[PDB]
């Protein structure tokens, strides 16, 4: 159950982040819109700056370093 919820949540963050990229970078030259940097077309787990990126402080500090200095 937790695995299914986590899969839906991370695909939700990926779709949100790529839509926000495709809106925000429509003026720079070059910039292929959503190409993964890797060559082999496989599902890779992202680097936790693509899931919790551009969030400004609260959720990223409670997410990456939350458990590390929680108690």
Ligand X SMILES: CCCCCCCCCCCCCCCCCC(=O)OC[C@H](COP(=O)(O)OCCN)OC(=O)CCCCCCCCCCCCCCCCC
CA dist 26 and 11 (Å) reads 23
Residue 38 within binding range of ligand X, rule CB under 6 A: no
Interface residues toward other proteins, by CB under 8 A: 1-8, 10-12, 14-18, 20-21, 23-25, 27-28, 32-57, 60-61, 63-65, 67-71
What is d(CA 66, CA 71) in angstroms, rounded to the nearest whole number?
Answer: 10
Out of other proteins, ligand X, none, what residue 47 binds, judged by CB under 5 to 8 A for its kind, is other proteins
Which residue sits closest to ligand X, CB atoms considered?
A: 69
d(CA 21, CA 42): 21
């Amino acid at each position: 159950l937790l695995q299914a919820e986590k899969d839906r949540r991370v695909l939700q963050m990926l779709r949100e982040n790529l839509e926000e990229e495709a809106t925000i970078m429509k003026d720079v030259p070059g910039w292929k819109v959503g190409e993964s940097v890797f060559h082999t077309t496989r599902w890779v787990t992202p680097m936790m700056g693509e899931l919790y990126g551009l969030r400004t402080g609260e959720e990223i500090l409670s997410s990456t370093y939350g458990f590390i200095w929680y108690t």
